[PDB]
């Protein structure tokens, strides 16, 4: 049900401290927000110019290149979210 | 809130399974027949639960 889905999303958000939002540049980009307080985030575009878009703690090209490979070549969203989270948290 | 279905799929694609009938969260990182079980009926902080889940999702 729509009610139960909303409740499960809220719990996932609390447990993972991961929220999935529309992208602040293109609303159809996806913005992953890490943390209670929007302390870290990264945006990805599906079929545009940049696969990996902006990210609040900006990331060097080596790091961005690694993230694109995890996401486009490996096609592993968990792995991408794990690496991106570590990378962003470590650039704060 | 039609986006909520897709969000739940994304979360489940990480291998994190809400299992509230048992008041716990399951973590299936390897699909090898082993699970991590995180109880919610405890005094663990939100910070500790979040740190644990991401620790298990990592390597």
């Amino acid at each position: 049900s729509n009610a139960n889905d909303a409740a499960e999303v809220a719990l996932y958000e609390r447990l993972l401290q991961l929220r999935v939002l529309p992208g602040a540049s293109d609303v159809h980009d996806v913005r992953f927000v890490f943390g209670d307080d929007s302390r870290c985030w990264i945006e990805v575009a599906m079929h545009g110019d940049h696969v990996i878009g902006n990210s609040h703690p900006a990331l060097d090209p080596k790091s961005r290149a690694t993230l694109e490979h995890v996401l486009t070549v490996q096609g592993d969203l968990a792995a991408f979210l794990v690496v991106a989270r570590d990378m962003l948290l470590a650039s704060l | 809130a039609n986006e909520n279905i897709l969000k739940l799929k994304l979360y489940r694609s990480l291998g994190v399974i809400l299992d509230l009938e048992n008041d716990q969260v399951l973590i299936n990182r390897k699909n090898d027949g082993n699970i991590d079980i995180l109880p919610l009926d405890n005094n663990l902080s939100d910070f500790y639960k979040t740190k644990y889940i991401w620790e298990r999702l990592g390597k």
Partner: peptide, 12 residues
């Protein structure tokens, strides 16, 4: 790739 695609179509 299909999960992000579905989220992008919904957000759009």
């Amino acid at each position: 790739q299909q999960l992000l695609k579905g989220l992008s179509l919904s957000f759009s």
